[PDB]
Symmetry: D2
């Protein structure tokens, strides 16, 4: 699955900062029950930045195990070095994941030619479907529509997670790609707008804690019932915004613990515990969404 409501799932941890299997199972069961279309395992919200490659691979395998064929699983596979992006992708060849989410190199700011060569190479070393992931605010570089057009000509490059929040990109990329190239929002607060312009779903942070509504909203969207969708959206909007009151996933982990979905809200440095003010803000947002 590469459409509807996809969760960018948190990696829940015990107090030592290591993945908590009971909490992960609970989270995966929740997504199955809720109608979530797929899981992104160890993306940005899953703390890929602070997990090493073995720890990252362990979490992917465990998620796939616990999914037990009931919900598809996409692995986060992004790296700023093309060699390392290839090597991480190779870990999951034959794993049972259905695709990889691969971020534009962060830090090193490659040209458009570099972003093309980076992704072309990654795709050539795998049979797995690739979803491009563009988020200039965290990376310092921006994958432009014309380059996405170029990369969509690659057989196993099948979609983009567009996390700029720049809605003009939906139709700019769409005119350049074939009809089966998938366009996913990576920005919760603009994701219904994104779908209304022709997007096919969202890789969502909000879905962590409001998975039924999110699944519902995206179904309505896909059916063209935007006014109906929009009522759910307005309910969720304080969460769409306030899950980023502090750096993600600091707020969404707290919100998971508060809803009894994970055992602890522990994160790895440089992520720090939610502040008192942030805790009151996310609680207000949860109340507004009717989640308690």
């Amino acid at each position: 699955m590469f459409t509807g409501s996809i969760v960018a799932i948190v990696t829940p941890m015990d107090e030592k900062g290591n993945v908590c299997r009971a909490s992960l199972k609970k989270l995966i069961d929740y997504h199955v029950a809720s109608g979530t279309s797929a899981i992104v395992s160890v993306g940005t919200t899953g703390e890929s930045a602070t997990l090493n490659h073995d720890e990252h691979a362990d979490v992917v395998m465990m998620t796939l195990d616990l999914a037990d064929g009931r919900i598809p699983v996409i692995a986060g596979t992004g790296a700023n070095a093309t060699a390392e992006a290839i090597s991480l992708t190779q870990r999951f060849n034959d794993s049972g994941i259905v695709g990889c989410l691969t971020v534009t190199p962060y830090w090193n700011r490659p040209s458009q030619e570099g972003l093309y060569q980076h992704f072309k190479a990654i795709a050539e070393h795998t049979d797995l479907p690739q979803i491009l992931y563009n988020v200039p605010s965290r990376t310092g570089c921006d994958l432009l529509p014309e380059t996405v057009g170029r990369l969509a000509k690659v057989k196993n490059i099948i979609g983009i997670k567009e996390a700029t929040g720049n809605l003009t990109r939906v139709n700019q990329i769409k005119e350049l790609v074939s009809d089966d190239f998938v366009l996913l929002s990576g920005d919760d607060a603009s994701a219904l707008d994104f779908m209304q312009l022709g997007g096919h779903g969202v890789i969502s942070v909000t879905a962590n804690v409001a998975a039924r509504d999110m699944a519902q909203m995206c179904k309505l969207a896909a059916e063209g019932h935007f006014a109906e969708a929009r009522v759910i959206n307005q309910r969720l909007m304080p969460l769409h915004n306030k899950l980023f009151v502090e750096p993600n996933p600091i707020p969404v982990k707290w919100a998971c613990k508060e809803l009894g979905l994970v055992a602890t809200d522990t994160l790895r440095l440089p992520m720090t515990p939610i502040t008192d003010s942030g805790r009151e803000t996310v609680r207000a947002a949860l109340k507004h969404a009717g989640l308690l």
Copy 2:
């Protein structure tokens, strides 16, 4: 040594992307002869992003060995996970380096408190001097002057490579820190203004190819001879700008190859070969510098 002209040295590579010892030796001899104050080994310009930790450690050791006591060496040790930053620093304990250049976490966008805890933990677990490194354009986060002031109270956090190009930062930081905290520009094009405002030197890309002029410019500025320094700077300005016409270190490695300082201008993906138009911009800048 943490003042004056400090080179962010390229990691010269053969056609296979492997460190070239002979090219490194030439570059180190060049810096010893040209009066460069120190060498930043495997920083951003040294392609830290695309070397793994073993290659990274290898280049630092090789640099230190070749320097043979003639020039101080500072290791790039930044990482986005605090544990990984700490662990990389441990590799360089007792190595003979004089200090570390440690970047603000990139990608994950921590809060100011998170950066505080990041750098505090790194400094705690080493005796080596630590130079903080701010470059929001690549990292998506900005270490603010206030958090710098808090960090400067840590005994072994001794300076900052301020790479924003925002010159108001010089005196915002200076008023918060003790007289002996070192302020270094990480932006070649504004580095002379940075020093005129109170900064102590530069960690420089331009210095890779204009070592002597950079060293003289920085000594003049330290002496308050800004008008004299500026004459040199006006001749180095095209190079200050066009060394970034394509992503650093693409132009500067091409420059080094053109001067005969390195055997090849090879980089690792996602860095790609210089375009023809870049060759001409860079060659023009070199000639304006009087280097060709």
Copy 3:
């Protein structure tokens, strides 16, 4: 009319910089023939900045005369001083114009409270319908959705020309206003996207020289035929972009002269004649739209 394709009509001038009546008549006849819904007289594209209030009023009256009841006419009435915005609006009370387009004060950067008080007062001194006009790039201030919500409660404040190009604003403003509050794009290149999200039309520069297509496109949009609309849009897109290759209305005046629609492309300082390179770019864009 406050929906469909509204032209932000150029004020054509003879070589002395004074309105050319023959060219204006020709332009108005063209819009009638073409199916344009309304004319904005002496907005930004009509050079309100360089016309004095008497000259501005003369052009409005002449346009209304020449329209001869065949096409509705909206007067530009924006001023940065509330007194002067009121006095200009008063000139057109009982003129036969159907509404006023009124820009957020430029230069002085009022708060949201100030923008509220400015527009509330303007609306209180007239019976004419008011369209808010938001274009932060030219004004240095931004009318936020919440303030537009506040102002839509005023009886004669009936719509907004949203010229930010920020598509997220369509649904942000829409949730805050009643169903009959009109939402108009003021950005040609994103205007179909804007309509697709729920907008009701566009105040267009492109419509100056491609009025049939624009009228056609907006009809399709309003009918929900976006794929069909989008084909016209792709035809017009080089014009949407290149009519701003030089400051507006420098390119659209040249394009009008080239199509034989105005006698001359004369503008008032600080607008300068189109450059040779700009002339070749706008000609290419016109050829692409199939206009010759």
Copy 4:
């Protein structure tokens, strides 16, 4: 006089928004006593935006009359139409003012060539010295250093009020212009750094309420006593920032009323009364300055 501390003087108004001669007299006497170098009359801080040309001329004449030869007066004369700028300048010929402060056209966003022709024409039709005025944040256009260099060759274009806060501009401009061209900060918070880099003074909002300290700070900076100047600046810094907590001149007129320098703190729409929270920020800044 075009060096040192120059005040962008408020236009004091009674409760009806009319110039208050008695409050203006007090302010002028205050500047004569406090060693202010000159007075900018009816600039941005003097609410040029909301006075018509007759009121504008009236305030300038009244200021000049009250100054009575004791302090030089510079008129704000900027306008967005070249004809109107020229025509406003003619009003001040033979008035006794020493020069004009003329803003880059706001709103209409001319090209660099257009700004060149704008200022060239203004300078042509007067013998009065002209100070260019760059503030992109209010105008939406940026006079670049290159266009400044071209303009500085005009005999009576003698300086620039650089109000961007971008300190790299100081030496980009200085290298292009002759030694006698005057560079003035129009950004209070970065004005000392601006002078330390080579600027000759400031056209200041802070000077309205901290005239003596501003004059001393600027004399120290001119003498190269930057450390001494900076002590004063650190005490003026909260005022440098919080005089812009609400749109200028709202905070500074409230400040002037609080010190008893003006009878009322009344402004013209779209400026609105200071909020209660602004009162407290500003009162705190005044106390930190030692003024209350």
